[PDB]
Ligand SMILES: [Mn+2]
């Protein structure tokens with residue numbers, strides 16, 4: 001994993017949000033979290049081959065802090081429909 005992505009993961013807040021891994025400007029995986037810190041730190045010790053691939057292929061990580069868990073649910077669904085990222089199921 002790129003050093004800049006590891007740093008961004010370790011700085012993420014204990015707040016609800018949506019996250020987007022990208023390569024060359026294109027989303028490759030979109031997810032949501034009750035706490036961005038907890039879900040993003042799980043990418044550091046990969047429990048599945050899919051989690052390993054997402055963290056190695058990415059050259060960028062974007063995070064979006066939201067108002068609450070209801071906003072996280074609908075924003076994540078809308079962005080998956082818009083971008084159809086390679087590692088999200090269809
Ligand atoms: Mn590494």
Ligand SMILES: [Mn+2]
Nearest residue numbers: 030031032076
């Ligand atoms: Mn999801």
Ligand SMILES: [Mn+2]
Nearest residue numbers: 047048049050
């Ligand atoms: Mn496996």
Ligand SMILES: [Mn+2]
Nearest residue numbers: 004005060061
């Ligand atoms: Mn980055």
Ligand SMILES: [Mn+2]
Nearest residue numbers: 022060061062
């Ligand atoms: Mn960007």
